[PDB]
Amino acid sequence: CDAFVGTWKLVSSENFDDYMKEVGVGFATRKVAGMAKPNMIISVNGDVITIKSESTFKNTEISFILGQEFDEVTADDRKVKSTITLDGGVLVHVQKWDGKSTTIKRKREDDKLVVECVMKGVTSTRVYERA
Numbered sequence: 001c002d003a004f005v006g007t008w009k010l011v012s013s014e015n016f017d018d019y020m021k022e023v024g025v026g027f028a029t030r031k032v033a034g035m036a037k038p039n040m041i042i043s044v045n046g047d048v049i050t051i052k053s054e055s056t057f058k059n060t061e062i063s064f065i066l067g068q069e070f071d072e073v074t075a076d077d078r079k080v081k082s083t084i085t086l087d088g089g090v091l092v093h094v095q096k097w098d099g100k101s102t103t104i105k106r107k108r109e110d111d112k113l114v115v116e117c118v119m120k121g122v123t124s125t126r127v128y129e130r131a
């Protein structure tokens with residue numbers, strides 16, 4: 001994950017409101033989150049990866065070891081069972097809750113960190129760059 005490590009800032013978003021609707025996020029949360037411009041602070045210490053984010057919407061953080069499932073409280077307040085793995089240099093993040101699943105992939109592309117969120121056919125792409 002050496003290439004993921006650092007402080008990242010959101011530079012663009014596409015279809016994130018639709019992805020959120022598909023996830024089940026309610027109107028007001030969708031409006032406020034859609035407006036936010038979160039950063040990501042990604043760090044690695046031994047086998048533990050931490051993804052931290054500060055924004056006006058919410059400050060959240062997850063720490064995890066690849067391949068090992070963990071409890072996650074998402075920024076929209078879902079309690080999910082999550083596993084994050086590395087597949088050919090792509091971080092693959094699967095969230096399970098209420099019989100539902102969503103997969104989020106993060107990859108380095110040129111100088112960008114590209115986040116792709118997928119649920120039931122709806123994809124959002126969020127692009128980050130180094131702060």
Ligand SMILES: CCc1c(-c2ccccc2)c(-c2ccccc2)nn1-c1ccccc1-c1cccc(OCC(=O)O)c1
Pocket residue numbers: 010020025033034036037038039040051052053055057058060061062074075076104115117126
């Ligand atoms: C990056 C900050 C953040 C937001 C957010 C989104 C928009 C504005 C403000 C904050 C959310 C979120 C997800 C779904 C619904 C409502 C909020 N989760 N995290 C987060 C915070 C720590 C670790 C991981 C993740 C995360 C998990 C799953 C999908 C994600 O993809 C959104 C993106 O990469 O931009 C991001």
